[PDB]
Amino acid sequence: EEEDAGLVAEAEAVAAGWMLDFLCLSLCRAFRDGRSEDFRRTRNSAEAIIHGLSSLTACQLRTIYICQFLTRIAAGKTLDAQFENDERITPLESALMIWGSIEKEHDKLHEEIQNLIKIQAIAVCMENGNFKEAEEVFERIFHMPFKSKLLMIISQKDTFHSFFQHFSYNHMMEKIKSYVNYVLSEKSSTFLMKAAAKVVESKR
Amino acid sequence: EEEDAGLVAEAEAVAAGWMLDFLCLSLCRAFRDGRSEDFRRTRNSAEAIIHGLSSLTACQLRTIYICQFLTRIAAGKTLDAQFENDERITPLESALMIWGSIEKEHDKLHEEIQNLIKIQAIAVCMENGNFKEAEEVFERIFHMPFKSKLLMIISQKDTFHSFFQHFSYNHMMEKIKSYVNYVLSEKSSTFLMKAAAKVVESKR
Ligand SMILES: NC(=S)Nc1ccc(OC(F)(F)F)cc1
Ligand SMILES: NC(=S)Nc1ccc(OC(F)(F)F)cc1
Ligand SMILES: [Ca+2]
Ligand SMILES: [Ca+2]
């Protein structure tokens, strides 16, 4: 009776762990495929499932961090979004913090994604006329010639600057998409996806 | 490439169908066990998953209706809740509508649950001093001596009436709990629960 409820609670935690892993892989695929509405709906589902979990493995935690990074990148141009308690932190800044916090290899792609997020953290402020906010973002983030080039753009208020087109928002998105693809490779092995795929194939 | 994405979308629909069935059984168990917070968190998860589904089988639809009934019964005393577009409809009234709409057998238990919900739809208005609202609930719902007994209580404003203790809120809850148990029996066969349970047992 008391031990029966304990078995039930354990089974529900195993099932929730599977649902989280499936939702996390489905969210990454949507980001990669540009399916914004699916991303939005899958994120809501993943967040709710997390609220119903208590124990998280290191792999599940790292996986949750990846989904948060993607969510903030997707809201990168939404400066009215507050993802941190400090209301001064921009979405792209919050993503950078996560990117630097994820337990992952620091390969060339990692640094390129990092540097593109820093450039775009400033560019989205300039592109909304928020020149004082770009200066504040710049100080919280800041590569000496790279740093001095950005400050020069902020002070002159040149919003449509050529530098921001060479290291554009699309460029940042594509490199982030390349990373997700590598991740998606590793998560196509999840239990729920594998089982569902077999059913689909069984009916083909 | 185009057919690959189609297979992926099909597999995600099969996985979502499994997640819905698991969440629906977990929600019923919490209601039965009196775990209110788990019910609240599981309901949020189930609602999000539904927003990510397009096709629903008749069994999945009937199952969704059961969960909605339970949600409204749980908010039966929350008269500030609007579950219907008509803001005049009380939560218990909305549950009664669903109870009369579910494709299920109309056994003695079915009618008893129905009659107890009708009594309590009036009793929760009286118990908040909302005597005019009890009269409006009464007209939208209304067994001639049964009907005339309730109107007599409403007009005399007797809120703590003995009739409302014989056919009490707890009594309505217990009979609804008996039904869920029968339902829970049939849903313990779901794929996710079965698989998770095996894992738990494999580690016992
Ligand atoms: N507001 C935000 S960024 N919250 C959030 C939490 C968790 C999360 O991972 C996921 F649930 F999707 F797996 C994504 C976003
Ligand atoms: N507001 C309400 S009553 N909405 C709701 C929708 C669906 C539902 O079934 C479930 F998702 F839980 F399976 C429960 C409640
Ligand atoms: Ca702002
Ligand atoms: Ca009201």
Side-chain angles (χ1 to χ4, degrees), chain B residues 158 161-164 166-169 171-181 183-185 189-194:
Chain B
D158 202 23
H161 199 279
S162 74
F163 179 86
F164 293 152
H166 200 94
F167 305 123
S168 66
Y169 202 88
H171 277 71
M172 174 188 83
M173 294 297 288
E174 282 305 307
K175 293 272 186 171
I176 294 171
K177 285 178 178 165
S178 288
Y179 168 77
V180 176
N181 290 342
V183 172
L184 282 178
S185 305
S189 54
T190 56
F191 172 72
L192 236 55
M193 187 61 173
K194 181 187 60 181

Side-chain angles (χ1 to χ4, degrees), chain A residues 79 81 83 87-95 121 125 133 137 140:
Chain A
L79 301 179
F83 286 96
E87 59 287 319
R88 306 178 301 105
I89 308 309
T90 60
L92 288 180
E93 279 177 292
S94 184
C125 291
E133 196 188 25
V137 166
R140 290 193 298 270

Side-chain angles (χ1 to χ4, degrees), chain A residues 8 10-12 26 192 196 200, chain B residues 10-12 26 29 192 196 200:
Chain A
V8 165
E10 278 184 21
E12 292 183 339
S26 169
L192 236 55
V200 176
Chain B
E10 278 184 21
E12 292 183 339
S26 169
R29 182 176 286 100
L192 236 55
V200 176

Side-chain angles (χ1 to χ4, degrees), chain B residues 44-131 133-134 136-138 140-142 144-146 148 150-155 158 161-164 166-169 171-181 183-185 189-197 199-200:
Chain B
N44 302 341
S45 302
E47 178 183 350
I49 299 293
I50 298 171
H51 291 335
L53 276 161
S54 66
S55 280
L56 287 175
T57 63
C59 294
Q60 291 182 318
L61 186 53
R62 165 204 161 271
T63 295
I64 284 166
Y65 291 158
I66 298 164
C67 301
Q68 292 173 333
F69 169 78
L70 298 178
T71 298
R72 289 151 167 83
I73 294 294
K77 295 179 175 179
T78 310
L79 301 179
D80 293 355
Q82 179 181 351
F83 286 96
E84 305 275 4
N85 304 350
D86 180 356
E87 59 287 319
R88 306 178 301 105
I89 308 309
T90 60
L92 288 180
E93 279 177 292
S94 184
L96 189 67
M97 288 167 50
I98 303 180
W99 193 240
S101 288
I102 295 173
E103 226 69 46
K104 67 178 280 292
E105 71 202 341
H106 287 179
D107 56 13
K108 189 53 167 261
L109 180 56
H110 178 93
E111 213 179 15
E112 286 196 359
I113 286 168
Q114 172 193 277
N115 284 343
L116 288 160
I117 293 165
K118 291 182 176 180
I119 291 166
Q120 286 307 307
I122 291 148
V124 305
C125 291
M126 307 278 298
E127 283 153 22
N128 288 112
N130 305 170
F131 312 124
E133 196 188 25
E136 301 175 313
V137 166
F138 172 86
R140 290 193 298 270
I141 286 170
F142 295 97
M144 269 296 278
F146 169 50
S148 83
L150 276 171
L151 189 58
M152 191 83 200
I153 298 168
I154 297 167
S155 70
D158 202 23
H161 199 279
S162 74
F163 179 86
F164 293 152
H166 200 94
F167 305 123
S168 66
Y169 202 88
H171 277 71
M172 174 188 83
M173 294 297 288
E174 282 305 307
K175 293 272 186 171
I176 294 171
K177 285 178 178 165
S178 288
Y179 168 77
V180 176
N181 290 342
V183 172
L184 282 178
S185 305
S189 54
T190 56
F191 172 72
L192 236 55
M193 187 61 173
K194 181 187 60 181
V199 178
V200 176

Side-chain angles (χ1 to χ4, degrees), chain A residues 130-131 133-134 136-138 140-142 144-146 148 150-155 158 161-164 166-169 171-181 183-185 189-197:
Chain A
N130 305 170
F131 312 124
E133 196 188 25
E136 301 175 313
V137 166
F138 172 86
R140 290 193 298 270
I141 286 170
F142 295 97
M144 269 296 278
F146 169 50
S148 83
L150 276 171
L151 189 58
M152 191 83 200
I153 298 168
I154 297 167
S155 70
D158 202 23
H161 199 279
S162 74
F163 179 86
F164 293 152
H166 200 94
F167 305 123
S168 66
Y169 202 88
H171 277 71
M172 174 188 83
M173 294 297 288
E174 282 305 307
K175 293 272 186 171
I176 294 171
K177 285 178 178 165
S178 288
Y179 168 77
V180 176
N181 290 342
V183 172
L184 282 178
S185 305
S189 54
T190 56
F191 172 72
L192 236 55
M193 187 61 173
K194 181 187 60 181

